[PDB]
Coordinates of C-alpha atoms and ligand atoms in Angstrom, one line a residue:
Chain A
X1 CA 0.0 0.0 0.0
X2 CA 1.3 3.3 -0.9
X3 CA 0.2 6.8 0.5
X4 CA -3.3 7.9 0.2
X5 CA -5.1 11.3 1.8
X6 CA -7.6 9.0 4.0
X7 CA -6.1 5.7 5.0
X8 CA -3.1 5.5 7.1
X9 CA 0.2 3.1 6.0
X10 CA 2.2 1.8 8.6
X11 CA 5.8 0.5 8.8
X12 CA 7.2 -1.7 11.6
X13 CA 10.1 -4.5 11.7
X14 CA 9.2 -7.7 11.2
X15 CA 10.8 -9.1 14.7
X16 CA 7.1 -7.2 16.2
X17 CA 4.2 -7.5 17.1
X18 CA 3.0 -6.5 13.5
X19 CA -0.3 -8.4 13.4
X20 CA -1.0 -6.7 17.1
X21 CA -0.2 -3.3 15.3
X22 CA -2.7 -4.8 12.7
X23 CA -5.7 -5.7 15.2
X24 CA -5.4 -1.8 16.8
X25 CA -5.7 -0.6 12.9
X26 CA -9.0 -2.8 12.3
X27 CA -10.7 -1.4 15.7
X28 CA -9.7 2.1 14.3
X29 CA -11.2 1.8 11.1
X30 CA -14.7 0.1 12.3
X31 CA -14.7 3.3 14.7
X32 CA -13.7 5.8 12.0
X33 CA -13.8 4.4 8.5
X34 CA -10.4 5.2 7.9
X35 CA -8.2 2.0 6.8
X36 CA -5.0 1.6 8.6
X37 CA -2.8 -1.0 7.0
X38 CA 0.8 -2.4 8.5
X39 CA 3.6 -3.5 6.5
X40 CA 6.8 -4.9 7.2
X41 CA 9.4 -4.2 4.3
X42 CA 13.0 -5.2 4.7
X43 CA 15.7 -2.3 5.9
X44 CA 13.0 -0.3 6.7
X45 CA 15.0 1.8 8.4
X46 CA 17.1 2.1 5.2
X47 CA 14.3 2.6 2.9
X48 CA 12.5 5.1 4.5
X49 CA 15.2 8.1 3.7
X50 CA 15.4 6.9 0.0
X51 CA 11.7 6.6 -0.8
X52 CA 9.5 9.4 1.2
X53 CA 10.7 12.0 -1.3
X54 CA 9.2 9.9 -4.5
X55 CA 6.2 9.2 -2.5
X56 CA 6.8 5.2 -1.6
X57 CA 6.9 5.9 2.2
X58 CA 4.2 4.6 4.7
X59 CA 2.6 7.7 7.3
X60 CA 4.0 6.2 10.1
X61 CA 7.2 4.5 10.9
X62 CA 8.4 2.3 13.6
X63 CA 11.7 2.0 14.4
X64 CA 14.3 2.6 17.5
X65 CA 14.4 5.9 18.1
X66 CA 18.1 6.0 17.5
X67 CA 17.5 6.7 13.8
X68 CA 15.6 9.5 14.0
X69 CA 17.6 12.4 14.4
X70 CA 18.7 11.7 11.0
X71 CA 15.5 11.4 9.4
X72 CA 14.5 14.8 11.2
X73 CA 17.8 16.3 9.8
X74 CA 16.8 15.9 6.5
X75 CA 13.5 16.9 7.2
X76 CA 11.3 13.6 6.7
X77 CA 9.5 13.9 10.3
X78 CA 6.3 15.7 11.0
X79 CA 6.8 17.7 14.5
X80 CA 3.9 16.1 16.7
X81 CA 2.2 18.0 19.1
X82 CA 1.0 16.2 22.0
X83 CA -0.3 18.2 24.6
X84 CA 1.2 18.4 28.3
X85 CA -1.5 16.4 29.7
X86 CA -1.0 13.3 26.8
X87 CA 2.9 13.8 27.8
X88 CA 2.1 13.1 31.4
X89 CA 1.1 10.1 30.6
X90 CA 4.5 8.5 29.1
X91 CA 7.7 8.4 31.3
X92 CA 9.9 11.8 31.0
X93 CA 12.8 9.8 29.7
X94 CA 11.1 8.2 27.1
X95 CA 10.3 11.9 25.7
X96 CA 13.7 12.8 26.2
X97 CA 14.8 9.8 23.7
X98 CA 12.3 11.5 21.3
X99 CA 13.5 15.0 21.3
X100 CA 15.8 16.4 18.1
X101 CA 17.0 20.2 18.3
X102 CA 14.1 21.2 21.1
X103 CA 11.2 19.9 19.3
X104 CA 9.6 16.0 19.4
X105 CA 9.9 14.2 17.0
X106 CA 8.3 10.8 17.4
X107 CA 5.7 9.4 20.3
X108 CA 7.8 7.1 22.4
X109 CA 6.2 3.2 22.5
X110 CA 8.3 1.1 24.1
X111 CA 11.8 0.9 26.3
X112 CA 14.1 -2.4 25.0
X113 CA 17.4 -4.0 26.1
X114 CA 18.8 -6.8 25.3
X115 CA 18.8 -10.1 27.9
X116 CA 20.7 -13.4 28.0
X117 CA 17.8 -16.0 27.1
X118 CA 18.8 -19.4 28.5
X119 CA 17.6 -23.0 28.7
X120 CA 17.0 -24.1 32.0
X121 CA 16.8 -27.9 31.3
X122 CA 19.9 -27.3 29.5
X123 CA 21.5 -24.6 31.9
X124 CA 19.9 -24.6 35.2
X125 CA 22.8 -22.0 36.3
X126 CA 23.4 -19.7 33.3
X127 CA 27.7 -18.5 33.4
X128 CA 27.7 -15.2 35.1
X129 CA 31.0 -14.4 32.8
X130 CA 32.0 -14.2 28.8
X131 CA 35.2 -15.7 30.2
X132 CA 33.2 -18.9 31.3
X133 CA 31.5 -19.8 28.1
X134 CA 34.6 -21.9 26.3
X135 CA 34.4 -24.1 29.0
X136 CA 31.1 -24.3 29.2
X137 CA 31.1 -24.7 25.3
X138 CA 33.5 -27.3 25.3
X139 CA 31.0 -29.0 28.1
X140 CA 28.1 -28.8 25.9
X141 CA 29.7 -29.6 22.6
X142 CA 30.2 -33.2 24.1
X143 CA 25.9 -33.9 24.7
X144 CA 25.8 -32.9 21.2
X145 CA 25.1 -29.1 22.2
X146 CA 26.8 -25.8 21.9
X147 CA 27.0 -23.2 24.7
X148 CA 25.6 -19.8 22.9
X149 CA 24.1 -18.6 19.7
X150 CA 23.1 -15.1 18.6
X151 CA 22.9 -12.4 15.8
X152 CA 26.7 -12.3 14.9
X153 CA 25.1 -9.7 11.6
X154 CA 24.2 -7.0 13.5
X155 CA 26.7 -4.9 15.8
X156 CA 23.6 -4.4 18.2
X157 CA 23.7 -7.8 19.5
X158 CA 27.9 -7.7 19.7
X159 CA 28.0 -4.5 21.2
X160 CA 27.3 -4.9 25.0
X161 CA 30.5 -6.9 25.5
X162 CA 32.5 -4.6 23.3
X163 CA 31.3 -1.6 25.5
X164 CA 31.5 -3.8 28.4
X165 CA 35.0 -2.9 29.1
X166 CA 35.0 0.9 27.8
X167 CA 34.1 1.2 24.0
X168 CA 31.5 4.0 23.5
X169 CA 29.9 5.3 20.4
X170 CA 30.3 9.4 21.0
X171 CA 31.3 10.6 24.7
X172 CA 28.6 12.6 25.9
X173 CA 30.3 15.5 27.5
X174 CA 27.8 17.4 29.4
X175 CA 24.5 18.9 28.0
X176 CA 25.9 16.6 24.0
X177 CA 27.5 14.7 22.2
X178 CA 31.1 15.1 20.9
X179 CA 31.0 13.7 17.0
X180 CA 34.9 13.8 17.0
X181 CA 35.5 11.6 20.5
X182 CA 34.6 7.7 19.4
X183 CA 35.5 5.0 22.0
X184 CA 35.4 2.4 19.1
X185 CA 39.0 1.5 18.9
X186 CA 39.9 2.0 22.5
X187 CA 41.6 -0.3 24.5
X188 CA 38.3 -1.7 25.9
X189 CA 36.0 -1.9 22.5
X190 CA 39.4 -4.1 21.5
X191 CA 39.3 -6.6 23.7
X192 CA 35.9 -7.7 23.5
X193 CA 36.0 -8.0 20.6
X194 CA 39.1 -9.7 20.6
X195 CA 37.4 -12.2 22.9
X196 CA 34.2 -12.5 20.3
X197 CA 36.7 -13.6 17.4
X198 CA 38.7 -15.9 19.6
X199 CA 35.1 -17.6 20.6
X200 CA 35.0 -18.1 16.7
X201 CA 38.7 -18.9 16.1
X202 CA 38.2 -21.9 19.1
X203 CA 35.0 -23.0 17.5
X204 CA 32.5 -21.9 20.3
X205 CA 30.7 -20.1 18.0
X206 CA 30.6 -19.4 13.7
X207 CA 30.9 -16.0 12.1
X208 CA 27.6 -16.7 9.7
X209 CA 25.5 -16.8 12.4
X210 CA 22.3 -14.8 12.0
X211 CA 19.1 -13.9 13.7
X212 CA 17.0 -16.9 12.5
X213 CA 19.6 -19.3 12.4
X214 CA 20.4 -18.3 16.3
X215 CA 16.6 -18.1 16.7
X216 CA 15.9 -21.5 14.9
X217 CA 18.8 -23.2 17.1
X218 CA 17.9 -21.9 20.6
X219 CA 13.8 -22.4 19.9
X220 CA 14.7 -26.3 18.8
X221 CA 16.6 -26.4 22.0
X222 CA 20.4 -27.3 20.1
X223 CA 21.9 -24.3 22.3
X224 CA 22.2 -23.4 25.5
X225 CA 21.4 -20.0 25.2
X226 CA 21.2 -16.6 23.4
X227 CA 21.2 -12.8 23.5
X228 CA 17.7 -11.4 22.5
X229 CA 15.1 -8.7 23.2
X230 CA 11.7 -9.1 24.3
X231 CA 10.2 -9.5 21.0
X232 CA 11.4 -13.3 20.7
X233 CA 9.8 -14.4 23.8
X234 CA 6.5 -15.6 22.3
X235 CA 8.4 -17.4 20.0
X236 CA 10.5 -19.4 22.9
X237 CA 6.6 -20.0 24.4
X238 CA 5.2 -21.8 21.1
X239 CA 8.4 -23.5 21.6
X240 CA 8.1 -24.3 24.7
X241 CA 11.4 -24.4 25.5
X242 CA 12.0 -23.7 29.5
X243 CA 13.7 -20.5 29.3
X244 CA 14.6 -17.9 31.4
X245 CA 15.6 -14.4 31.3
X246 CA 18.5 -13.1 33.4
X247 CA 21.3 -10.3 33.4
X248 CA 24.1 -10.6 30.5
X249 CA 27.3 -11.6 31.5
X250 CA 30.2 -10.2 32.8
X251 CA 33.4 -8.9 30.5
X252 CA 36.5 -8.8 32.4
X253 CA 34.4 -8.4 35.8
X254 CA 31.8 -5.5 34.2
X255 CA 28.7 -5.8 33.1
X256 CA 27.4 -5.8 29.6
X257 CA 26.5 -2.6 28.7
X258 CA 23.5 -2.7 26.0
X259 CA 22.5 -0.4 23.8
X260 CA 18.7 1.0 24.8
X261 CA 16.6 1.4 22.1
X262 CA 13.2 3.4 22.7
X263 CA 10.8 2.0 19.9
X264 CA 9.0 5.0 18.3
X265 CA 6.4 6.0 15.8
X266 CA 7.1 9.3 13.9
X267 CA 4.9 10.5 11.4
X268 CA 6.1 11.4 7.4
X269 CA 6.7 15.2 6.6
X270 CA 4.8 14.3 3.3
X271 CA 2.0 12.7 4.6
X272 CA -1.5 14.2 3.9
X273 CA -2.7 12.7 7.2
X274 CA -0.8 14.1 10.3
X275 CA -3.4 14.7 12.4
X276 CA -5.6 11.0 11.7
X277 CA -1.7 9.7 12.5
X278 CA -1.6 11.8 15.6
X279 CA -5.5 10.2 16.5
X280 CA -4.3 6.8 16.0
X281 CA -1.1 6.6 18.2
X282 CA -2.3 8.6 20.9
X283 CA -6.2 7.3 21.2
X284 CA -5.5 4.0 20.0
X285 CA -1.8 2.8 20.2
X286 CA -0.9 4.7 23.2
X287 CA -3.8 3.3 25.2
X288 CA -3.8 -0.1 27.4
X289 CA -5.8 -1.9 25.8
X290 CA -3.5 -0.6 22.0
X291 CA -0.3 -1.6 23.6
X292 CA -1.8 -5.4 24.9
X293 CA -2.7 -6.1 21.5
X294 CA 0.5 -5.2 20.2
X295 CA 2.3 -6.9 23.7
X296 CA 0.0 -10.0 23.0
X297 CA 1.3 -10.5 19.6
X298 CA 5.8 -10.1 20.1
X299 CA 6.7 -8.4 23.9
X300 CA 6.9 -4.9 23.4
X301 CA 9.5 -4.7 26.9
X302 CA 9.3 -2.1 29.4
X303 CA 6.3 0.6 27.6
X304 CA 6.5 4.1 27.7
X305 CA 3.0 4.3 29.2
X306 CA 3.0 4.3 32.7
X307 CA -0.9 3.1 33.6
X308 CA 0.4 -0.1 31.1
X309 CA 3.9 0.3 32.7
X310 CA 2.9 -0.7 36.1
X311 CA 1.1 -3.8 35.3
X312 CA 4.0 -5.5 32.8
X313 CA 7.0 -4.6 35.6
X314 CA 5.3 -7.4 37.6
X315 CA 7.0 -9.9 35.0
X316 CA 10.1 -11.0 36.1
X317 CA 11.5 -11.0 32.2
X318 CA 10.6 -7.4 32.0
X319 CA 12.6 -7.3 35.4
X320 CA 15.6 -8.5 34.0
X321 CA 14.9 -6.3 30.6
X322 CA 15.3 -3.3 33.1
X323 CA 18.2 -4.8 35.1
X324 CA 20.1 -4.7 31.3
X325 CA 18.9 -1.3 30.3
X326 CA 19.9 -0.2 33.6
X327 CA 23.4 -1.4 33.3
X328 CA 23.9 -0.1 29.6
X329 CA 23.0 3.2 27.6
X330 CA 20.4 4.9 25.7
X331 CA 21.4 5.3 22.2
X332 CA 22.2 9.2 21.0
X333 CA 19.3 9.6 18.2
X334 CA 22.0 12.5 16.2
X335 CA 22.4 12.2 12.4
X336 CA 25.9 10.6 13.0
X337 CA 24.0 7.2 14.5
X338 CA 23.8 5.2 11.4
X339 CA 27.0 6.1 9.9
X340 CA 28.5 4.6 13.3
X341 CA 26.4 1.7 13.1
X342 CA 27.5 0.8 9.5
X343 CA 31.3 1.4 10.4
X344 CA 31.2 -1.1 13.9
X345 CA 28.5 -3.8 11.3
X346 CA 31.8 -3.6 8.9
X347 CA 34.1 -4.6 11.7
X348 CA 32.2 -7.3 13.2
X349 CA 31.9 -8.9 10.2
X350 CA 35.0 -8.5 9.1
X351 CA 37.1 -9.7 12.4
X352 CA 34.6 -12.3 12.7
X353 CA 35.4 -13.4 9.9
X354 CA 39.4 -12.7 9.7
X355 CA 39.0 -10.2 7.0
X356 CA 40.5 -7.8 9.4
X357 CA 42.4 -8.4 12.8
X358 CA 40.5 -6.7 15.4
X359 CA 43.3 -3.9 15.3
X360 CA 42.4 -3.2 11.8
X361 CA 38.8 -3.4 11.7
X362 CA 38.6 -1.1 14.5
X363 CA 41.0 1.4 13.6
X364 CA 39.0 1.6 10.3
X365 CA 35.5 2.0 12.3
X366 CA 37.2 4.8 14.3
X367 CA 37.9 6.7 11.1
X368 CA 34.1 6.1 9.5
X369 CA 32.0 6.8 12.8
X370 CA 34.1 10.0 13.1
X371 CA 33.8 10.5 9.2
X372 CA 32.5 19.1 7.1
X373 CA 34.1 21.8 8.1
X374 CA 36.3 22.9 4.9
X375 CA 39.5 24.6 5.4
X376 CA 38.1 27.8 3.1
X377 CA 35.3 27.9 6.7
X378 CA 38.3 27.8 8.9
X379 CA 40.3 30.9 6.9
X380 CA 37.2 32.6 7.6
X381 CA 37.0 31.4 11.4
X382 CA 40.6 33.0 12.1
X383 CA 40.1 35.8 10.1
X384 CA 36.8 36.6 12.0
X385 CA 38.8 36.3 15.6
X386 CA 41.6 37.9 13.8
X387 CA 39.6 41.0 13.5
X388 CA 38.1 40.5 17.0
X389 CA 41.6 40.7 18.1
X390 CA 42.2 43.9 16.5
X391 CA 39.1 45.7 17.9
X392 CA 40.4 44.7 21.5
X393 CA 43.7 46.4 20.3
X394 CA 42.2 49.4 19.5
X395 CA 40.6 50.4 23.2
X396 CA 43.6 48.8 25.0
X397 CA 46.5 50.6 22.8
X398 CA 58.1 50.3 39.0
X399 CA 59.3 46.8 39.6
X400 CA 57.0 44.8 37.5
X401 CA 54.5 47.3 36.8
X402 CA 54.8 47.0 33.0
X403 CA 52.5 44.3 31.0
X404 CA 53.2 42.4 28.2
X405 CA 50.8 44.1 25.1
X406 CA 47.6 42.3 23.3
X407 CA 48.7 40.7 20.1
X408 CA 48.0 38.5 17.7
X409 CA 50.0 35.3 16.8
X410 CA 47.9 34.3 13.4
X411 CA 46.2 31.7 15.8
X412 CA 44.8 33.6 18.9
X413 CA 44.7 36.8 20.4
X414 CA 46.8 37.2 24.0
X415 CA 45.7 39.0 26.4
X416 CA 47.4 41.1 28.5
X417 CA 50.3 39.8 30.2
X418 CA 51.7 40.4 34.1
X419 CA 55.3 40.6 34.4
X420 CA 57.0 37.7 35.4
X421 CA 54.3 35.4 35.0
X422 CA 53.1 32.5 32.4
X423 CA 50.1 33.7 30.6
X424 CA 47.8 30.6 29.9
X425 CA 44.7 31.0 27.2
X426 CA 42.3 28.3 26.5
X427 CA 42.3 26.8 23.0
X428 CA 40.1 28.3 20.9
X429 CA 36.6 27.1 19.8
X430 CA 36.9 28.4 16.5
X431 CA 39.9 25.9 15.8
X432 CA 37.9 22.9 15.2
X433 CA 40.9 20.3 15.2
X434 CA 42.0 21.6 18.3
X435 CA 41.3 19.9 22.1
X436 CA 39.2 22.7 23.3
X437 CA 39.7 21.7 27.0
X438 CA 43.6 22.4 26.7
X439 CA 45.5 25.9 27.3
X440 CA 48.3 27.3 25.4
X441 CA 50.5 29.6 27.1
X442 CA 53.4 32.5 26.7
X443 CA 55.8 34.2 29.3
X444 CA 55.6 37.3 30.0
X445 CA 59.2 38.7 31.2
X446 CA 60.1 41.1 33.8
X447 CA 59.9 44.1 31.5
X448 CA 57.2 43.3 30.0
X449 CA 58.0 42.0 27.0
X450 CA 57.0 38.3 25.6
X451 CA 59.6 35.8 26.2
X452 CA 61.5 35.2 23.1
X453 CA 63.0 31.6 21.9
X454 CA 66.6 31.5 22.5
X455 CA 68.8 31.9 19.4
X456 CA 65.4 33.1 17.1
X457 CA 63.6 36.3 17.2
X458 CA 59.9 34.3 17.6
X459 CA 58.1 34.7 20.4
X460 CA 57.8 31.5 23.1
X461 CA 54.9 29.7 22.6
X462 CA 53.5 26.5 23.7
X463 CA 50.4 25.0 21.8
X464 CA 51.3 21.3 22.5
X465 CA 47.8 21.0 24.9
X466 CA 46.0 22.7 21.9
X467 CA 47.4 19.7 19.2
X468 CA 47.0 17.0 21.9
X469 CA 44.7 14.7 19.6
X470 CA 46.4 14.7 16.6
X471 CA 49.0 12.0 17.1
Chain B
X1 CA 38.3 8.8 4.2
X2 CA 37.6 12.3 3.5
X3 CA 39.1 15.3 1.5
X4 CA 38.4 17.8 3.3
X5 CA 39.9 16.9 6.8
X6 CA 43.0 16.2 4.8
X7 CA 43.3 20.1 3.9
X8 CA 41.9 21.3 7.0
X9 CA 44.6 19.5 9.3
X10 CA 47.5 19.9 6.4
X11 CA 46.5 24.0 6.7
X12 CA 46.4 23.5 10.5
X13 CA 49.5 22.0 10.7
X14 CA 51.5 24.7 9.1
X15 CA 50.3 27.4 10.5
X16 CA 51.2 25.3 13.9
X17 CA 54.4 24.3 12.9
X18 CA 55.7 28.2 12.3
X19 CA 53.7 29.2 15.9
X20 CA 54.4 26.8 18.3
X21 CA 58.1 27.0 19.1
X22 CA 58.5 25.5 22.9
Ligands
LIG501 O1 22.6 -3.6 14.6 C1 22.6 -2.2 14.4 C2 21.1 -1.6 14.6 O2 20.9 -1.7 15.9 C3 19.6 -1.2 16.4 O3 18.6 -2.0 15.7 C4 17.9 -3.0 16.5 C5 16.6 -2.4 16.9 O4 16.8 -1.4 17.8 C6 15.8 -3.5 17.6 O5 14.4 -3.0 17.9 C7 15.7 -4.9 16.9 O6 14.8 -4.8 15.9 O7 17.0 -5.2 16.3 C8 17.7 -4.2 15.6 C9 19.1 -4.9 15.3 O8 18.8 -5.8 14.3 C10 19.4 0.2 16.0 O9 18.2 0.7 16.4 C11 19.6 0.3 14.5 O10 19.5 1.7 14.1 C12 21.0 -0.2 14.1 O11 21.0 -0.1 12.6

């Protein structure tokens, strides 16, 4: 179904509860007329961005809200404008995930974190440690078993144990994030993924490994366990496999440290039919009885609804859910998302698969997830506090009672300087390569002149805490 | 990679290198 002024399309991954999403569509169109269908398409989240413009897009798109900042960026969300009183209603948090440049840009549905899913017949006591799991591999391996199968495809599924041990996506340095500070080639990211390729390089586990293949395998009970968000559960119960739910492992003593994705619903720019999409999620979907029938169909995990809320944090799956997300992070939702989540998929993959060492792989996911400010922008930049410099020159121009002048060095304007003593000035903002935590500094002399380099006629400068991140 | 951070941190570079003299 394509777009149409009077029916509403609907997009949603095909891991949920789809034909839930379906049922809530039917009771809104025998209240209203209006049709709502539900489609699943594959990369959704890909497809979105490359078919809204030629008018192949669905009104309404599920996906984690991680994505969406983009798709705001280049302008393919509606703003929505739910009043305070429907806000009240979801958890602050879950708004927060939401919010792009001050303004909302999806409803938020759903809160979800990845567990370790294990077979208690199998694995009455699940290993409380990555560092365990050979062993208990090797264990297994002999009933005609293996200890652990997951997504190996996705970097979602592979990232809590690389961030277990200090890999980050962008360091959030207070109030946002800093696009030039990845932690994906840190010491921390390497070694768990180190310890994800030696699992594959000691057989404990095989670098094809999928979602269905890892699904298939756990739900016909040939594994142990695997690493999956609510949405498989109701799989596991047609299965009925004896699982349980519990906290990931442990990497080197910390915990796993999952990505939390917030699923949302934002609403196409080009859609003819904001305001029946704003009826629907918030008077149908965003009810209790909307997010059971979705729930009933694939687990939506912790909801952002509290009434709804209250009732599903009695289940001791959504428990542990929580006890993961708790323990982890929620995603950034900026623009620079999915080029970070293409550059970590390459190096998976390709380490997994000894395309790459690790070293390589995530040297080369470093450079992508920090891959403009042109050097022309720049010329401008300096001359701009260049001339800035000069209109402070203009206003300002015994022992130690004679400063060092204002000047200009071609990179910043000093100050100022008191006799005798090291002038320190912070390095400047409009510099965009440079550490803009980091001082430089000159010394002032006795006279009141700048200290000169011995054997030159420059002036003594020291930019070395300016330059610190450039090898 | 990318182009533009290659003349962007060349430029900055120089004009560093002719500055900074601890
Ligand atoms: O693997 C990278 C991928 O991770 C996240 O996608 C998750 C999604 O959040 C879950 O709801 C579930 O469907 O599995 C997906 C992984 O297959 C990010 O949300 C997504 O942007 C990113 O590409």
């Amino acid at each position: 179904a394509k777009i149409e002024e009077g029916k509403l399309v609907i997009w949603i991954n095909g891991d949920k509860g789809y034909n839930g999403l379906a049922e809530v569509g039917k009771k809104f169109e025998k209240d209203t007329g209006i049709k709502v269908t539900v489609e699943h398409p594959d990369k959704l989240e890909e497809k979105f961005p490359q078919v809204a413009a030629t008018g192949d897009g669905p009104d309404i798109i599920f996906w984690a809200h991680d994505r969406f900042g983009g798709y705001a960026q280049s302008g393919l969300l509606a703003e929505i404008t739910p009043d305070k009183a429907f806000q009240d209603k979801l958890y602050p948090f879950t708004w927060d995930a939401v919010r792009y440049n001050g303004k909302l840009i999806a409803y938020p549905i759903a809160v979800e974190a990845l567990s370790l899913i294990y077979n208690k017949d199998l694995l009455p006591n699940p290993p409380k440690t990555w560092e365990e799991i050979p062993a208990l591999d090797k264990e297994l391996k002999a009933k005609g078993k293996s200890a652990l199968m997951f997504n190996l495809q996705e970097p979602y599924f592979t990232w809590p144990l690389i961030a277990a041990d200090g890999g980050y996506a962008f360091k959030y340095e207070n109030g946002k994030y800093d696009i030039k500070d990845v932690g994906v080639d840190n010491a921390g990211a390497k070694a768990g993924l180190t310890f994800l390729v030696d699992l594959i390089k000691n057989k404990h586990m095989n670098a094809d490994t999928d979602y269905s293949i890892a699904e298939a395998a756990f739900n016909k009970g040939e594994t142990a366990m695997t690493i999956n968000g609510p949405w498989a559960w109701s799989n596991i119960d047609t299965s009925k496999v004896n699982y349980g739910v519990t906290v990931l492992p442990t990497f080197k003593g910390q915990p796993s440290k999952p990505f939390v994705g917030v699923l949302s619903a934002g609403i196409n720019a080009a859609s003819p039919n904001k305001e029946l999409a704003k009826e629907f999620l918030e008077n149908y979907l965003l009810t209790d009885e909307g997010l059971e029938a979705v729930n009933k169909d694939k687990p939506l995990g912790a909801v952002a609804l509290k009434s709804y809320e209250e009732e599903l944090a009695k289940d001791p799956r959504i428990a542990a859910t929580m006890e993961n997300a708790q323990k982890g992070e929620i995603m950034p939702n900026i623009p620079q998302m999915s080029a970070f989540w293409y550059a970590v998929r390459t190096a998976v993959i390709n380490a997994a698969s000894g395309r790459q060492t690790v070293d390589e792989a995530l040297k080369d996911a470093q450079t992508n997830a920090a891959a403009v400010m042109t050097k022309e922008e720049q010329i401008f930049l300096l001359h701009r506090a260049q001339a800035q410099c000069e209109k402070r020159l203009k206003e300002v121009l015994r022992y130690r009672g004679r400063p060092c002048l204002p000047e200009w060095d071609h990179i910043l304007c000093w100050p100022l300087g008191a006799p005798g003593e090291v002038v320190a000035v912070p390095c400047p903002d409009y510099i965009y390569d440079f550490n803009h935590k980091g001082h430089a500094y000159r010394r002032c002399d006795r006279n009141g002149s700048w200290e000169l380099v011995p054997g030159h006629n420059r002036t003594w400068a020291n930019y070395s805490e300016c330059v610190k991140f450039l090898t | 990679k990318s182009i533009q951070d290659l003349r962007r941190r060349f430029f900055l570079h120089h004009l560093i290198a002719e500055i900074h003299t601890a």
